[PDB]
Amino acid sequence: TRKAVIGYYFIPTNQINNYTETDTSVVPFPVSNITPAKAKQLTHINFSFLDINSNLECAWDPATNDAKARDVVNRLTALKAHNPSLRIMFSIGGWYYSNDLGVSHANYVNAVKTPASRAKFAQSCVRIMKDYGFDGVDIDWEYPQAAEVDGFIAALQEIRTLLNQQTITDGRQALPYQLTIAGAGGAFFLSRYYSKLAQIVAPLDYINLMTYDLAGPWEKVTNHQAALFGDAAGPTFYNALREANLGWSWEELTRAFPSPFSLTVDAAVQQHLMMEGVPSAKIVMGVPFYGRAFKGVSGGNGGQYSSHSTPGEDPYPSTDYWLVGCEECVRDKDPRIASYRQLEQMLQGNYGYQRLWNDKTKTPYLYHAQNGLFVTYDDAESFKYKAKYIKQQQLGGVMFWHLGQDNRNGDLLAALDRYFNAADYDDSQLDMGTGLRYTGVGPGNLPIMTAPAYVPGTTYAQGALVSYQGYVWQTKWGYITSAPGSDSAWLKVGRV
Amino acid sequence: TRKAVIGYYFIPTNQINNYTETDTSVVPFPVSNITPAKAKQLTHINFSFLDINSNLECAWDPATNDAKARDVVNRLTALKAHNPSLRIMFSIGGWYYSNDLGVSHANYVNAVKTPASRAKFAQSCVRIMKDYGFDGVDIDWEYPQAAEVDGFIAALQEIRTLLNQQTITDGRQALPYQLTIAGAGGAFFLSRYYSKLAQIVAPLDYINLMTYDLAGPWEKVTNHQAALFGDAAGPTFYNALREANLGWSWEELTRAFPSPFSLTVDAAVQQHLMMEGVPSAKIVMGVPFYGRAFKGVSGGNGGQYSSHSTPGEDPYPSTDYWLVGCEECVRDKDPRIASYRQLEQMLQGNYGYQRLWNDKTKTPYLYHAQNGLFVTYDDAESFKYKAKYIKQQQLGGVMFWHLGQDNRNGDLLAALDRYFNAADYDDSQLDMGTGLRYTGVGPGNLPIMTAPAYVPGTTYAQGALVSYQGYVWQTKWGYITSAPGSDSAWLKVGRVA
Ligand SMILES: Cc1cccn2c(=O)c3cc(C(=O)NCc4cccnc4)c(N)[n+](C[C@H]4CCCO4)c3nc12
Ligand SMILES: Cc1cccn2c(=O)c3cc(C(=O)NCc4cccnc4)c(N)[n+](C[C@H]4CCCO4)c3nc12
Ligand SMILES: Cc1cccn2c(=O)c3cc(C(=O)NCc4cccnc4)c(N)[n+](C[C@H]4CCCO4)c3nc12
């Protein structure tokens, strides 16, 4: 099974309305920059972002020039001439539209409320897909809360039904229409819907975990934003999942959700695999094509794990563009984010940066000794370890934000495709290091065990192991005369 | 409101069929030993035990001579001439009949299964009560499991309906027929039904907690079997309630059920009070009229919290009767249980025992220095603190097992009545000590708190407190943009006035 390679294509409305493929000053990353070689290295392009309007329907930004928008999408779907497996998805949501404090948040809550609203919203998704020529629907609601999850589920189920019927109607058995979501990659947002992961993922082809932004100006201690494994010297976090409305016992919560823990990519993946009904092949690991920069950091450890003075507000509440050498930061008016393309040029232009490597997290980072700056980012080296992880854990593939942040040669995308598909690349001896692994155990990743069959009428001592109804159970205290599952005394510890 | 004083009267079928009041070798504790003075000190006598037969009806042991049974019960109900508040209850169950491996266990599970079976069983309970002259029904099922609790509750409700109708029919408004159960006194058995305590206790007049046997030879470390409060120097136990099917979060389970914890009487009472809908006035504290003995006790502990070499297997797997001076242990053939009557007779007959006192647990214990023996028991002094606890916590009263283990003068029963009712007893200055209290917090004992009202649209930092929909909530982490109760981020920590 070929690994998915899902690249976001993001274009703001102003750039759509003024679209041109011959002037990077207006449109920095036109569709023409996606060469045939790059199209062949992708399996999915997530066009972004559409929204949910006050009519509770999928819709473009109301300021969008529809004729210019159709032309942009047509240029993307023309790329399928170079890659018969390529799908041009469209994404609904993103942080700006759909976060709790976002401009359109209430429309997401209201669209999934009722059977009538869900049917109307689901129909509009398929309509938009067919009217503009997209190959599937991606929903990036960041993020539905506990009371909204069941409606969110039924809406996804409704879209799945309509997409499957549309696949048959259009003869698309060879390339069926698909449904994906961007899912939270950290435990705090994940706890909103974690208990219902199985019913969320059931109608999806993939859940694309946003396993980045695990550090940012909203945290007082600098850190890697997409550490693969944990560094004991770095900060640790409250494991919010132990508070999810799971109904598990104290022992089950404790063994599944050690706290505090290292907020890493491996943690997010393992937390998903701990849940019953979440298959590894549907889990896609997100990676960032951008870095996050911090100022006012101290010395002694390359700027890692230090206090900082980076503004947290949105948008950037100043004109102080303090990321030395970041020309894109001036154009975008924000020194806290830098594309890999810009970071590469900052490393090549003598601005005082050093590129350092953390062999526990398996991620690079920049340090500016003279102005106290720290940048966490990913590159082709960190992608070696993440690609091997994807293969070892039998995940569905990789996702990234976004195509316009790769360098001009497309080195990041080419690296991902190479690590998955190149016949002359061999990572069998790649050293995954001694960084901290997430060691939680849950119902979905219980180890295989053997035990004598449970015998009704037997009195079991503390620590006894029995097999019953497909699982191996252990007594939590002594003098146990009840059957596993009928009591508080038995802990499910294994399967088969 | 007078505190309940509930004494079990237990008599085996063998003793009923051969009942006599002039031969202690056949019947050691005849009803005649319950003098008018003792009858006035009781509010309830739990006659025990009846059973549930394979027809799923309340019934006497099939080997019971029915005429002899009626005669024994009549001697108990005649005691009401001396005490117009006294009730002769009858108890269905007990350990032998109703434990998971007991001879009649399946009858208890099956009787509560369906509306028809519950109706048939409930009718048989009231029929037995009226036929033999009892004043109420007590059910000692030890213990219903999670899947059986809902049927068990519906059966209790059905008995409640029939008892209330029988009260009206018999003009017994001045002394209505009552319904009680014996409940678990330790967290392990309690976890079976803990989540449904409110609906279990609703149809009852009392739930009589079996707050004894909290220690015994089956434990590797000697301990008090009915410690009122905890001793930090003593052993601690897994808090099984954190594994009950409550649906609470990790923070809520941890805050309600500290673990490990001291297995005490106070723990069991407070664990019941942590649940909403469980009124203190229905909780009755059980006390033992017997002791538990250990050997091999090695230490300067006074024998407390020490390793031991006591069998604690049943039945006693030896003939070594090493409890020096326990003659009842020889006749009964078990050196690990002794009535208070015998323990007193061991103390006054020169056997080398020292009576020591633990001022944390507020319980006495025996220690035999030359042979290293340890006995945990209760007496009139430990009952002072338990009686004051009952009054301070506004509990319903006290229960004890059993009447035949008191001394001949009835000193234990007289002490309980004195501490509740005597005008010349004054425990106002009795110091309850510094033993460990159970400090768990649950929905039934959330404190009143004050906090600013939650404001929609606000982003809250970690540890922020807000009031919302009748509760005070605290954030467990930062950058909170959700409303309390809609999220995993908010912890219920208090109630709004
Ligand atoms: C406050 C905050 C707290 C915790 C997490 N947070 C984010 O995880 C986050 C992500 C994003 C984001 O867009 N990631 C890329 C992306 C790509 C594709 C789809 N979805 C998202 C974001 N813009 N912000 C707000 C920034 C903007 C300036 C300062 O705060 C975010 N804030 C927070
Ligand atoms: C209250 C009590 C009263 C009287 C006797 N008692 C015991 O003789 C006893 C033995 C044991 C025990 O473990 N024996 C060893 C063993 C282990 C496994 C298989 N066969 C034998 C025990 N755990 N408890 C506590 C209760 C609490 C919940 C369930 O058990 C016991 N309680 C009591
Ligand atoms: C084996 C055992 C294991 C776990 C718990 N167990 C008891 O909780 C228990 C209680 C009683 C009992 O009667 N408590 C007083 C009473 C008063 C009113 C209503 N119900 C009960 C008991 N007799 N045994 C038998 C044992 C004891 C030693 C040899 O045989 C019991 N055994 C066990």
mmCIF file of N, CA, C and O in Angstrom, chain A residues 366-394:
data_model
loop_
_atom_site.group_PDB
_atom_site.id
_atom_site.type_symbol
_atom_site.label_atom_id
_atom_site.label_comp_id
_atom_site.label_asym_id
_atom_site.label_seq_id
_atom_site.Cartn_x
_atom_site.Cartn_y
_atom_site.Cartn_z
ATOM 1 N N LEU A 366 17.237 26.260 15.128
ATOM 2 C CA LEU A 366 18.161 27.366 14.933
ATOM 3 C C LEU A 366 18.341 28.132 16.236
ATOM 4 O O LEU A 366 17.417 28.247 17.044
ATOM 5 N N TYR A 367 19.551 28.649 16.435
ATOM 6 C CA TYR A 367 19.860 29.457 17.603
ATOM 7 C C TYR A 367 20.648 30.676 17.151
ATOM 8 O O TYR A 367 21.632 30.545 16.418
ATOM 9 N N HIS A 368 20.206 31.855 17.578
ATOM 10 C CA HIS A 368 20.870 33.118 17.264
ATOM 11 C C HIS A 368 21.469 33.646 18.559
ATOM 12 O O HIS A 368 20.772 34.260 19.372
ATOM 13 N N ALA A 369 22.765 33.391 18.749
ATOM 14 C CA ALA A 369 23.433 33.777 19.988
ATOM 15 C C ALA A 369 23.383 35.284 20.211
ATOM 16 O O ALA A 369 23.172 35.742 21.338
ATOM 17 N N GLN A 370 23.581 36.073 19.151
ATOM 18 C CA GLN A 370 23.773 37.510 19.323
ATOM 19 C C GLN A 370 22.476 38.247 19.651
ATOM 20 O O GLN A 370 22.505 39.237 20.390
ATOM 21 N N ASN A 371 21.329 37.781 19.151
ATOM 22 C CA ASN A 371 20.058 38.433 19.453
ATOM 23 C C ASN A 371 19.097 37.539 20.224
ATOM 24 O O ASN A 371 17.926 37.898 20.379
ATOM 25 N N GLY A 372 19.569 36.409 20.744
ATOM 26 C CA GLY A 372 18.753 35.553 21.582
ATOM 27 C C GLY A 372 17.487 35.087 20.888
ATOM 28 O O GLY A 372 16.382 35.354 21.369
ATOM 29 N N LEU A 373 17.629 34.392 19.760
ATOM 30 C CA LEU A 373 16.491 33.882 19.010
ATOM 31 C C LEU A 373 16.546 32.361 18.938
ATOM 32 O O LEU A 373 17.625 31.760 18.916
ATOM 33 N N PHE A 374 15.365 31.747 18.890
ATOM 34 C CA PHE A 374 15.226 30.299 18.801
ATOM 35 C C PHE A 374 14.147 29.965 17.784
ATOM 36 O O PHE A 374 13.055 30.536 17.831
ATOM 37 N N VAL A 375 14.448 29.037 16.876
ATOM 38 C CA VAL A 375 13.493 28.586 15.871
ATOM 39 C C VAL A 375 13.408 27.068 15.928
ATOM 40 O O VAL A 375 14.431 26.381 15.826
ATOM 41 N N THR A 376 12.194 26.545 16.091
ATOM 42 C CA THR A 376 11.937 25.116 15.975
ATOM 43 C C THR A 376 11.314 24.836 14.613
ATOM 44 O O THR A 376 10.345 25.495 14.223
ATOM 45 N N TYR A 377 11.870 23.867 13.891
ATOM 46 C CA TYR A 377 11.392 23.555 12.548
ATOM 47 C C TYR A 377 11.736 22.106 12.232
ATOM 48 O O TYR A 377 12.343 21.399 13.042
ATOM 49 N N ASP A 378 11.308 21.658 11.055
ATOM 50 C CA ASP A 378 11.599 20.330 10.542
ATOM 51 C C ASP A 378 12.315 20.444 9.202
ATOM 52 O O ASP A 378 12.180 21.441 8.485
ATOM 53 N N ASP A 379 13.075 19.408 8.858
ATOM 54 C CA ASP A 379 13.798 19.400 7.590
ATOM 55 C C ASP A 379 13.856 17.967 7.067
ATOM 56 O O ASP A 379 13.188 17.069 7.590
ATOM 57 N N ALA A 380 14.658 17.756 6.020
ATOM 58 C CA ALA A 380 14.769 16.434 5.411
ATOM 59 C C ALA A 380 15.388 15.411 6.354
ATOM 60 O O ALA A 380 15.175 14.208 6.169
ATOM 61 N N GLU A 381 16.160 15.855 7.347
ATOM 62 C CA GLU A 381 16.753 14.916 8.291
ATOM 63 C C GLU A 381 15.728 14.438 9.314
ATOM 64 O O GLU A 381 15.609 13.235 9.564
ATOM 65 N N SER A 382 14.963 15.363 9.900
ATOM 66 C CA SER A 382 13.916 14.947 10.829
ATOM 67 C C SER A 382 12.871 14.086 10.132
ATOM 68 O O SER A 382 12.284 13.193 10.756
ATOM 69 N N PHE A 383 12.645 14.319 8.838
ATOM 70 C CA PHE A 383 11.672 13.530 8.092
ATOM 71 C C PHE A 383 12.130 12.093 7.866
ATOM 72 O O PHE A 383 11.289 11.229 7.601
ATOM 73 N N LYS A 384 13.434 11.814 7.954
ATOM 74 C CA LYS A 384 13.889 10.427 7.891
ATOM 75 C C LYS A 384 13.312 9.617 9.043
ATOM 76 O O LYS A 384 12.815 8.502 8.851
ATOM 77 N N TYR A 385 13.382 10.164 10.255
ATOM 78 C CA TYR A 385 12.918 9.437 11.428
ATOM 79 C C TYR A 385 11.399 9.350 11.453
ATOM 80 O O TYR A 385 10.833 8.323 11.847
ATOM 81 N N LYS A 386 10.721 10.415 11.026
ATOM 82 C CA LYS A 386 9.263 10.388 11.007
ATOM 83 C C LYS A 386 8.734 9.453 9.927
ATOM 84 O O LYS A 386 7.713 8.785 10.129
ATOM 85 N N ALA A 387 9.420 9.374 8.779
ATOM 86 C CA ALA A 387 9.006 8.434 7.741
ATOM 87 C C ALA A 387 9.203 6.991 8.188
ATOM 88 O O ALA A 387 8.370 6.126 7.897
ATOM 89 N N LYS A 388 10.308 6.706 8.883
ATOM 90 C CA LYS A 388 10.507 5.354 9.393
ATOM 91 C C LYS A 388 9.466 5.013 10.452
ATOM 92 O O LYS A 388 8.954 3.888 10.487
ATOM 93 N N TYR A 389 9.135 5.977 11.316
ATOM 94 C CA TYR A 389 8.066 5.785 12.293
ATOM 95 C C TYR A 389 6.752 5.435 11.606
ATOM 96 O O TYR A 389 6.050 4.501 12.014
ATOM 97 N N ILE A 390 6.413 6.169 10.544
ATOM 98 C CA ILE A 390 5.183 5.915 9.801
ATOM 99 C C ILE A 390 5.170 4.489 9.267
ATOM 100 O O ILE A 390 4.140 3.804 9.297
ATOM 101 N N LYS A 391 6.322 4.010 8.795
ATOM 102 C CA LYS A 391 6.392 2.646 8.284
ATOM 103 C C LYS A 391 6.355 1.627 9.418
ATOM 104 O O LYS A 391 5.647 0.617 9.323
ATOM 105 N N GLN A 392 7.100 1.880 10.502
ATOM 106 C CA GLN A 392 7.140 0.934 11.616
ATOM 107 C C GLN A 392 5.770 0.776 12.258
ATOM 108 O O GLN A 392 5.371 -0.337 12.622
ATOM 109 N N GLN A 393 5.048 1.878 12.426
ATOM 110 C CA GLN A 393 3.746 1.870 13.075
ATOM 111 C C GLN A 393 2.610 1.607 12.099
ATOM 112 O O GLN A 393 1.444 1.650 12.506
ATOM 113 N N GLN A 394 2.927 1.352 10.829
ATOM 114 C CA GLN A 394 1.934 1.015 9.809
ATOM 115 C C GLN A 394 0.861 2.096 9.695
ATOM 116 O O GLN A 394 -0.337 1.809 9.614
#
